[PDB]
């Protein structure tokens, strides 16, 4: 049967995904669970971080959403770093997102930013304490991923930061 909290959690995942700010804020004032997740552990923070919705990210954070939540794969910081959302990365970090969290493959966000050729995000990560020596389950490093991905500029930055 239908339950209040679950339905509001559903609505919240939906709205956070869709980028609907008004809906998200309203759902906040109605007590929707900021930490609701789907079958795969996807939280509203994950969705917003990934689909580039900055307002919604800040709102969820201020309402206490778990910055370091793992879903089936990773943390919100991973998603934002992989998707090339610089500001979301900065906010996430400002709110205590772990710069070195490792996903189910042992990727850190530095791994993903380097793989995806996002340089400015690589710099923000480094400046925030990212470890260049982090090794994924393939024994691969962020420098490794940058080189493997045609990212040589990013590689130079990483090499200089070691």
């Amino acid at each position: 049967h239908h339950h209040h909290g679950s339905d509001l959690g559903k609505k919240l995942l939906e709205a956070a995904r869709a980028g609907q700010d008004d809906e998200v804020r309203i759902l906040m004032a109605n007590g929707a669970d900021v930490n609701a997740h789907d079958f795969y552990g996807i939280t509203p923070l994950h969705l917003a971080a990934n689909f580039g919705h900055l307002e919604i990210v800040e709102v969820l954070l201020k309402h206490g959403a778990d910055v370091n939540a793992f879903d089936y794969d990773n943390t919100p910081l991973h998603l934002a770093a992989d998707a090339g959302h610089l500001e979301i990365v900065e906010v996430l970090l400002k709110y205590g997102a772990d710069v070195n969290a490792s996903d189910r493959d042992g990727h850190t966000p530095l791994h993903l930013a380097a793989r995806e050729g996002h340089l400015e995000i690589v710099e923000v990560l480094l400046k925030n304490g990212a470890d260049v020596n982090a090794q994924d389950k393939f024994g691969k490093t962020p420098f490794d991923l940058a080189i493997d991905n045609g990212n040589e500029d990013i590689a130079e930055v990483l090499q200089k930061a070691a």
Binding site: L13, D38, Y40, I42, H46, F51, Y72
Partner: protein
């Protein structure tokens, strides 16, 4: 080979079964949403046997039937989405009791866009054993999956659509 789906959603139909038959009989590819709703226990659904593709969303809801012969459906494109979210929605099927026992979608491979919603199906088994991430397409990895959580899967698999060896993922 080709047919139009329907826009009716959760709205009450009653002759309804006949329209569904005349619509989908023989149809391989659905050019709209496949909405199967408010079907009673004695309903004969065999005219769904040919369905291969669905361009819209699949909606299965408020049915008393124990089975929905969708075994031939390989792909849901999700160019239209139920509640703007889910390409597959199986809701409230239920009330020997009625209601969907098993999804049995043996051929389901790709869900191109949109998520999965399976809720309040009191007789249904195995929905939670399926690896849905494998089915979602490469750019669909972030769609919402909300599903409720029975004999074990056939030992010949532990991921299955139903009890039979034919039902393994």
């Amino acid at each position: 080979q080709v047919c139009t789906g329907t826009d009716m959603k959760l709205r009450l139909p009653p002759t309804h079964l006949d329209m569904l038959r005349h619509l989908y009989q023989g149809c391989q590819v659905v050019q709209g949403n496949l909405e199967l709703t408010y079907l009673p226990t004695d309903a004969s659904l065999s005219f769904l046997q040919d369905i291969q593709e669905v361009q819209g969303y699949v909606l299965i809801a408020h049915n008393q039937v124990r089975q929905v012969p969708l075994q031939r459906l390989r792909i849901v494109r999700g160019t239209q989405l139920f509640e703007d979210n889910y390409a597959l929605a199986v809701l409230d099927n239920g009330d020997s009791p009625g209601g969907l026992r098993e999804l049995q979608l043996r051929s389901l491979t790709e869900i191109l866009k949109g998520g999965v919603l399976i809720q309040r199906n009191p007789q249904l088994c195995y929905q939670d054993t399926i690896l849905w991430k494998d089915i979602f397409h490469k750019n669909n990895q972030l769609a919402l999956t909300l599903i409720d959580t029975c004999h074990p899967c056939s030992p010949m698999c532990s991921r299955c659509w139903g009890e039979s060896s034919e039902d393994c993922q």
